[PDB]
Design a binder for this molecule. Structure first.
Ligand SMILES: [Fe+3]
Ligand SMILES: [Fe+3]
Ligand SMILES: [Fe+3]
Ligand SMILES: [Fe+3]
Lengths: 202, 238, 238, 202, 238, 202, 238, 202
């Protein structure tokens, strides 16, 4: 048996290779980005946004974030999904974004995911899996985003209930807001300190 | 064959989050321990990227940004295999790379190093592994990069890489180095990895029989991702 | 102090003339043995070059040929001492160097390698050693150079140097390499030197305390020339 | 005690660094060359020329040659000369040249040297010390050029007489010629084979 | 998969042309160095031989020349695999072998050794490797052969073999020996090979589990040919 | 990675196994030989002949020679030929022969090959690749045979022009002769010494 | 000679700020990493102290505080050289020392140890290094000192020293120990130094040939400070 | 090359040797202290004072502090100053002090320094370099004191601007106060915790 290749930080220029456009580099015709909504994509459109803060409370302006989620009916656009249900054919389920160099705000345009089966017959509440990479971060940090309007589902979620500190569960709940017709969920991440976001070893 | 969860990540084979010698980690590392969870469909699934959307020079860093001529620097081919911990090939995984130019200069707004910029080099590429888990790309060997950790810190020559493969749990970003580089022994970033054998797993080896005469040298570098276990009794994943 | 002759050259510390692995030597090596002679004024004397005729950038290969900008490549400073075999400093010796650019390309009519030419790099410099025998120059680290000996032969990165010092008998041309370069082990030219300790005498060492932050790395390389013996009894030189 | 730094070939581009002008490189204001005659230099002007041949009889077109010699009165312009006589102040005593890339001919403009003292009271015949560097030559090859019109001096030269093969001594004698008022000495060097030039370990 | 050239022959893994201890080489070795060339279609192509033209006993040296009875000597089976340097099987390669009989006597006009001739042994065979690169033949173990190099020179027992495979560049003739033969240490012909590990690559190993009871012993011997590199960028072959 | 099996001489009896008929051994029904012309083979028939000489100028009477060449249109009868053109179906492209034990003459009956593409768009002049094996020869010696009547093609050949010693190129040119209607090309090989044939590392 | 900046401090050759085994450091160590800066005139300059203001017994701890008689304890002379990391002598540097008496008792208000006070010993001295970087002082060997870290903690015998030399960047305070003291192996303060070779750099060596018969023993102890690099190209300091 | 002698704490009795008077030890006639103002010293007299706090917010009563600064015209009284300007001849530029054992207050009487050149043509704002030694501190801690009334200069200071956390820059700015005609700058140092003072590796 082999050992996993060891992780190393993405470093401060993680944009050159993962988001060449943010670095002002035009090498690829088709570029990956933060928009998971195609014209025929099913489901309710939502905007997910926030900032990532370091231990002194300052936003990281060099952070790279990716998300992975299921479609509107709770099915992943992956050959590894074994639900036997058809996935929305116009949905990649993944996106990548970087924080704005001046402000530190990041965002994604996506769809609110449907509930996905949990282990042993359980049901997980709607959630988006998120990973953070940056200079100073030696291994990508995994976390999940739940939704504050899914109170009943969250109360029964297996992963949220496996966090013994009830007070820490709240760091994983994004707040719904409604900016001019659009539904926005605010999710700020605190890497270290008071109200530190729960991070998972998955 | 019914697949179960990925094997647990062996935290002792990776750098810790808090590593004082790499100063930026001091304020960007969680104080709380990570919370381990049992895997669900969310962790064992991952996106699929289509070969059709890749350009012909996406894995050719020598030419994908060349405008008036060729970039200046050492022509090198890098290839290898991507497999999981049980030795199975990782097929159609998305491999992305990025690096500095021959001067050790990044084409990034925030890089003010005096090493000269090369108008014919971009520094990023991508490719999908084939059915055998094989990948190959061509580039210019990057120069070592001075940075501010201690005032005279220098990164060994290196190339950053990222893999998105079959399961979200395999998601990985790292960096590989070149056999023989003396700065490998002094780098605080490489030293965040606790064991010697793991630091060596990031060094690409000179592959002399694969050099192309009067053209390019060649380095061999293989990558290992987490592997899934098979289930033969209860299937609790769902 | 009355000086006598230079100590005999130790032929076993040097490559032989005929070295089949370096193919060009087969027809350019004498068949007859060299004829050793006892030294005369002709062999113990040498010319003097004046410091006044050297330009300000003659030892700065980064800037002495820069027109529109800086050359592309790794900024490195090389320094060291020149002494004779008895350890005495060699003062005011003429040191000349030449090399390829960062791509492994020489600015020479006869070089057709595809590695890119750098309009801002020339590749030659010179300096005089000081009273302590010290020299220092700045350059771009050269890339390895493919050439036709066997079809896929590659020279390790290297810099050619020449010394004209106090006696014609000390006249010497050689090449030095960079610590860690894996091609050092495969080069037929370096292997013409019979002993391992002598091959190691041509490797410049990384000098980390002398790196200049956010600017240049540094290599230390010392050179040893033949030394003169002193005469205390008969003086047969004349 | 230290060992001498080991020699390595000058390689095929030995011109970049030793004769940048022949490589078309203008980096130095003052360049070293093959002309040892300054306007006030004393002595008879001569031109020394020839070709260097490999073992198949073909001329080397990448060879670099340097010469070292005394002034018209047999005194070296070197602090190491102990004759106590004043040297011609307008004489460097050294020059460097490369063969023509097309033809292989090399040449120097210099002065015919005066006789220099030999060891133990002897007198050496007039001679120029010459060294050759090239791709394929691992260590610079040392030889000397004597003059065919100095027959009596040559017969008494210590170095020439120390060569036991009388027939090999002749390879060190240049032939005087007179091209339109100018005195030319032709000296061809054969690195290997029949009539191979004598090379010295000095 | 687009194929490029064969990897360069590593001359240090082979005997030199001039090897004074093997006296016949003194006048049959070129004085000039070989000229290396870049490969063309001429060097990467080779003929194809058809299985249909091989007789049923072509790989059976015990029976292919038997007239009145069986040859005298030790019945042995030799088998193994032929692969290229990158480990790929060499399929349908033509393997030809020849050897002396049990007395160390060759059935050749020019052999006057007193060792007895065997009217039922010829000493030559051939076969094509299969899809796995496997070959097998049966023969009589040859006796050691005295010859005139120094007056009392003796070849260890040996079998000559020749391979014509996929590219003309892989063309190869050599000889293999039998594990344990004490003459292996004294042979000037085997000593023309410079390295010990390469001399060992010519020794066939006793394969005891493959002996056939009350019938024949068995030796295992694998052969490695030059291998082709794959091309992923420019294809200059044509 | 593996190292190539090291070469060893073919030895003096290389005929037993490679040309059993020359050794008077009848074991095979179908035997390989020096005749590459089948009845329907296309192209002009030529005879290639010569001797192989050792360093004292004596012919080797124990030498084994093989040749490899393209058909009349410059296409190799090999699956590795990538020209996309059809090869002469009645052509093996290879033959083997031994020198006559008494005289040392060797010969082949074949066809004059058509020109074959060279690297990077170039065209190679017509040539036959030849290899020599014998007692005293530790590794088979590779060379090529060009034709003296293909002067324009030879002048543009990439391999011939890569030999810097212009005088050595001529050792690779066979001389056309016409013995009673038949076209004969004489190609003598000198393994060592004056006029030594160029040998290649391919 | 134009001087540039001091070489970077090698943090791995020094104790970290946070060292849990030395309990007082837990609350007196910064949580944030130090910020490295490029040097300016502020960091490369330092004050000058004049020899004229030093008293005759300032380096004689045996006599500089003696009132009624000599102090009780072992008479020892300590000497050595102060040099920078490149081996150059440090001239006219201010060296200050302080220590406990023979009982392990400090003449300090806050020391309540029961070891007896010596009315004829003060415990502090100072001197300037000479032109060779040499210093010498005489004292009473201090006794080991019990303190409260763990309840039964004992410092090995030791002498505190401080240097103010040519640049503010060289500012340094440390402690040296005496060859052979068994408490050296148990001290948590000496163990804050990560490497063994560095812990050994603080042990003064017995110098037996320099003992003064029927008078005093002698210890040799050399000190190394940071060294400045020389500038040969751009001078960015100003 | 040699390694720097490793640092060790000054320990709790650092006063015996560095400020014998504070320990009540009279061994030296001339003693070093916290007064950098001599009668003819040029410039404006200021008093610099504060306390040093540990991680629980308690003052260190065993701390030793030294400062190093330029004269009124921004010139250091050091042979290493290369400005070519004459320094105030009645100025040592350095002082040492200890905190009061009961209260923990420390102070210096000095002069407000003039601006000193920065690297590459820049100008540094007025500042005093300060170092702290104490029991528990393994290596002297370096920091700088800037002045709140030098707002424009501070905004352009190279070192202050090299601190990325804008909020941490303020920990290096002393507050000007005016106690009965005297100008006092208050500078408190927090070794650990909230509002921790920036410390430098110089
Ligand atoms: Fe990087
Ligand atoms: Fe070179
Ligand atoms: Fe044999
Ligand atoms: Fe103490």
């Amino acid at each position: 048996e082999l050992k996993e290749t060891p992780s190393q930080t993405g470093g401060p220029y993680v944009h050159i290779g993962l988001l060449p456009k943010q670095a002002n580099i035009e090498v690829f015709e088709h570029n990956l980005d933060n928009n998971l909504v195609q014209d025929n994509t099913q489901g309710q459109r939502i905007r997910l946004e926030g900032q990532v803060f370091d231990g002194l409370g300052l936003p990281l302006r060099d952070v790279l974030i990716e998300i992975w989620q299921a479609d509107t009916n709770g099915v992943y656009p992956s050959q590894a999904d074994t639900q036997g249900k058809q996935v929305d054919p116009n949905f990649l389920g993944w996106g990548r974004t970087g924080a704005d160099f001046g402000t530190g705000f990041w965002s994604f345009n996506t769809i609110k995911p449907g509930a996905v089966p949990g282990r042993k017959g359980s049901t997980q509440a709607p959630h988006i899996s998120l990973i953070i990479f940056a200079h100073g971060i030696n291994i990508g940090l995994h976390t999940r985003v739940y939704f504050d309007d899914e109170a009943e589902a969250n109360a029964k979620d297996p992963v949220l209930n496996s966090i013994e500190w009830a007070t820490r569960r709240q760091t994983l709940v994004a707040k719904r807001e409604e900016r001019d017709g659009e539904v926005v969920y605010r999710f700020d991440i605190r890497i270290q300190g008071e109200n530190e976001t729960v991070f998972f070893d998955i | 064959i019914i697949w179960g969860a990925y094997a647990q990540r062996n935290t002792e084979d990776h750098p810790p989050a808090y590593a004082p010698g790499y100063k930026t980690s001091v304020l960007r590392s969680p104080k709380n321990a990570l919370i381990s969870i049992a895997e669900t469909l969310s962790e064992v699934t991952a996106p699929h990227f289509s070969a059709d959307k890749f350009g012909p020079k996406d894995n050719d860093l020598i030419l994908n940004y060349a405008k008036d001529g060729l970039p200046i620097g050492e022509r090198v081919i890098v290839h290898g295999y991507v497999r999981d911990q049980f030795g199975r090939p990782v097929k159609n995984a998305l491999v992305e790379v990025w690096q500095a130019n021959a001067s050790g200069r990044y084409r990034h707004p925030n890089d003010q190093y005096i090493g000269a910029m090369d108008p014919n080099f971009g520094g990023c590429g991508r490719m999908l592994t084939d059915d055998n888990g094989y990948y190959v790309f061509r580039t210019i060997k990057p120069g070592p990069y001075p940075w501010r950790n201690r005032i005279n810190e220098w990164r060994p020559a290196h190339i950053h890489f990222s893999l998105i493969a079959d399961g979200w749990a395999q998601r990985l970003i790292s960096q590989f180095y070149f056999e023989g580089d003396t700065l490998i022994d002094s780098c605080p970033i490489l030293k965040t990895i606790p064991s010697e054998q793991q630091r060596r797993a990031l060094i690409a080896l000179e592959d002399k029989s694969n050099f192309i005469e009067a053209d390019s040298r060649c380095y061999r570098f293989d990558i290992t991702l987490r592997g899934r276990r098979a289930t033969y009794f209860e299937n609790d994943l769902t």
